[model samples]
Target: STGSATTTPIDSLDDAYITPVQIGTPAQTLNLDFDTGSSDLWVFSSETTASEVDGQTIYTPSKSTTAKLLSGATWSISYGDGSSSSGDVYTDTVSVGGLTVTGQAVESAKKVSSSFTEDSTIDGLLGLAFSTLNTVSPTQQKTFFDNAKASLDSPVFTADLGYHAPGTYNFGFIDTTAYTGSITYTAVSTKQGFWEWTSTGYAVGSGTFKSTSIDGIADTGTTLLYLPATVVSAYWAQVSGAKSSSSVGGYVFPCSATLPSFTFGVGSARIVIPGDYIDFGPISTGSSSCFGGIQSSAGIGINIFGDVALKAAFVVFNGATTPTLGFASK
Candidate 1:
């Protein structure tokens, strides 16, 4: 079986990608952020504290006859940005696009951090990473993709993130028309339960490509592109007046500065993030300084090729016996 779903950018900066998912028999729809960096399909629901719930659409288990509480199962997850959520688990009929999975583990939120509550657009998170990273205790649950992979025509899914537009996530099949040129496949290491891969090299704008082994994860959940300090410094140096500010939290420069493009190698292919995309908008409303989309990953522990880089290419998450990742230009 094959299924296709649309993922839309939550904001102009492409902060996050959200896809509609239906939970339970009555089909309670919630817009969930598709995160490949983690594995825990959780949602905002009636169990969530009232103060923690904003304008988000919550799932009411009582409304679905198919919903069943999972005895003693509970889950909790915290992200790189410090946002977190936790609650008891439930087995329910979950559907993404047209692909339906019975008894999918659905973690209902009892408490959530401030960041999640402030973002009204995302009702929950649908983790696409390996099931090993699932936070459900005693018995780690499988992700939506993992559970559906067996029935899929091909154990694979693709992420085609758009800039200021809606993109598509296809399951069980790859839409050849979604990308241009031949797809470059790379071996993925699921050791950390992430779609992790080693990048070939990098270059700042038209500069020479520096061939180096840069290990990182293809994370659609993260908003920026994080690399080694050396690579990040090289990119920012080209932009006049760019400076790293602790107060600002990252490298920032004049809003009118001519930013250089960033290119990274995947296997033998190169994906270029245009200069315009690197300008991550002004630091604040009416501010003259603009934040950079590329930053140092020193503090992050692992280098991350997040939405800033993913939006520049078509990404394939092949959940096969031996998983592999494919990249192609669009």
Candidate 2:
């Protein structure tokens, strides 16, 4: 069986989470976000303009004896949240857990948007989505997982996201000890380089699950859950004094409002979203107003089962030729 590595979440400026990864012959280490939402393994590096780097640690490729240029190749990517990073490409050894990809494509950033600049804790991003989503120019590059896939016991990974705490991301082999009960699975459709699936429906606290399906994807990089408006409005309506606040830029409610547990219908099973997790904690320290974690997926193309939703269950990302998602409550 393929080996596994553990991922610990560090609270970031954007409520983001990351996993530490080691790359290159000298083991240039970086705390990277294993993002199923994106498809490029890039890092802030020596190529990055010093003025924009701030206090962020960068991967100095020139120092790596094993690093070699990919010959005129480059990469550029803009994320859903409007943040972006791009630069030259290099072929270097990449390792995680007990596995290694001898010549993994490492995208070294020369330019980054302000959002990445402000995130002092994020060293880089490791895209776990399909290689078809890779943004390398003239020649689309392969991700670490994609290059290392053939060596793995099975092409599978699990995302055990945290709830205001740390979580684990096990690669290759499944850790049967981490999950309880049976894993209820649903087939994944990956046309857009994402693990896309449809939910049977949802419910607000005591309400019954309706048959309204919501198309969505599993996104570890995103902090909160973004669902369809029908589900978002329904949940917020149950919380007294909750309103859509354009100034706050989402939905906000009095800190004292009672919250209802949200539920998602998947396959033949239902996963209950934690009420406390929905709080997202006062928006800011002492503020009387707190932002609701669940928001509309209306403008965002597909609903995202972000950290908020993923933490409520143990997820098995079975990377079989035809992928499937197995969910079990913690």
Candidate 3:
């Protein structure tokens, strides 16, 4: 109960969805994915049945004294990759950097597939993305963010990912030390919490790649920045001494030197991506290596700017002031 309290009964998708509670210190980090689309931050537990593991990371509850099982609560989640898991509820003291939040809710899936139980990467994910997809209803429990907001130093929270390598996701109180300019805000649309953006065009090696404009969405839940194939090929061609190489079943580059820089226009915001990001590993049969900057979605319709692009800038989703997203320099 150290976070916040609400008398409202847990109802609706918003109520049950729990916010991400920062767990572990910077020395012992547990930065989890705060997914609004899913609930339950389940790490590999020692009690986890081996038959259920599908190669995902399992949190061992025995590793921490504060870990507690919820006895009967159950859960299951499916990702777009067709991977899924089911399990019971658990509680523990989760810490992040220097902050420690007690009674942190978590899930302990007993029947996870080998695909999800193998890798022991980061600790777990904290789902602060939204309120609709939470497992803990408002009547049942308040989300980690809703509870911690009072204690948080800033009313605003920002996700910083530019520092760590790919797969590194970090969250903290909004720090404005690096930004000296005013924040430009855009109203959020009612469709899903996705930040809608309009494309101005593309620029490669300081040259125009395309004049076609498009509207797209920015999502942190996605790992890769999905783009159209025509734009992807055009951007990749600008990388000097850069040749597409196949690696890890994805399109990658084998260049040893630095590559060219590309920029994309988000309305009036011009975001720049270095050449190093253009060479993502191969994922399909064609030689089409994933370019970090842009890729051909082949009319996938929606263009999603994932974590790869988010890490470069400071983003703020202001739901309180207005359904708007604010972007500033890191």
Candidate 4:
């Protein structure tokens, strides 16, 4: 079986991408963050504490006939930013696009961090990472991709994120027409339960490509592209007014500055992120200081090729016997 779904950015800055998912018996549709950085299909639900709930659309398990409690099951996930959420587990019928999976684990949140509630655009998160990273205690649960893989024509899913427009997430089959040029395949390491891979090299603007091994994870859950400090420094140095600002927590520059395009290598192929894409909007409303879409992964252990890079190309998450990743220019 194959399926497809539309994913759109929650805001103009492309902070994060979201997709609609149908959960439970009668099909409660909710806009969920399709995160590739973690593994836990959790949501704000009727079980969530009233104080923790904001404008999010909550999933009501009792309203669904197919819902069943995963007795004694609980889950908790904390982010690097100190935000977190915890919940009880439920098995229910979950659908993405037209693909349906019966008895898929659906975590119902009982508590959530203030940051999550403040972000009204996201109702929950649907993790696409390996099941090994699932936070469920006692027994782990498979993600939507894993549970649906057996039935899919091909054990794979593809991500195509747009800058401001809506993109697509296709399961089972790759849309050949969505990308241009040949796909450059790379081996993936699932030990960390992420779509982790090593990039060959990179180039700043029209500069020559430097040969280096850059290990990183392709994370849709992350908002920016984070590379080694050295690489990030090289890119930002070229900008006249760019500077790493502790006050802003990252490199910020003049909003009107002419930015350089960033290019990363996959095998022998090169995918370039347009300069405009890197010039992320102003740091604050009506502010002249703008934050960069690419930042340094100095403190973060592993580099992250997030939406900024993913949106520039077609990405394939292949779950074959020996997993692999595919990249193509779009």
lDDT of 1 by residue, 1-330 (tens): 988989999888889989999999889999999999999999999999999999999999989999999999999999999999999999999998999999999999999999999999999999999999999997899999998989999999999999889999899999999999989999999999899999999999999999999999999999999999999999999999999999999999999898888999998899999988887899999999999999999988999999999999999998888999999999
How high is each candidate's TM-score?
0.99, 0.96, 0.68, 0.99
Shift of residue 140 alpha carbon in model 3, Å? 8.4
lDDT tens per residue, model 2, 1-330: 465666766663237777777888799888888898888999999999887797777888888999999999999999989999889999988887767888899999999999988888888899988889999989998878788777788788888877767778877877788878788899799899888888888889988888777789988888889997878998999998999888877888898877788999788788998677788657778999988889988888889998888888889887788988889877
Ten contiguous residues minimizing lDDT sum, candidate 1: 273-282
The local lDDT score (0 to 100) that residue 89 gets in candidate 3 is: 68
Displacement of the residue 296 alpha carbon in candidate 3, Å = 3.8
Candidate 2 Cα misplacement greater than 4 A, ranges: 12-14
Q: Could you tell me how far off, in angstroms, the CA of residue 215 lies in candidate 2 after the best superposition?
A: 1.0
lDDT of 1: 0.94
Instruction: Estimate the overall C-alpha local distance difference test score of candidate 3.
Output: 0.51
lDDT of 1 at 119: 100
lDDT of 4 by residue, 1-330 (tens): 998999999998888888999999899998999988999999999999998888999999999999999999999999756789998999999999899999999999999999999998899999998999999988999999999999999999999999888999999999999999989999999999899999999999999999999999999998899999999999999999899999999999998899999999998889999998897788989999999999999888999999999999999999998999999999
Which segments of model 3 are wrong by more than 4 Å? 1-40, 51-72, 100-103, 135-143, 163-172, 180-182, 193-201, 209-217, 237-258, 281-293, 298-301
Cα lDDT for residue 258, model 1?
87
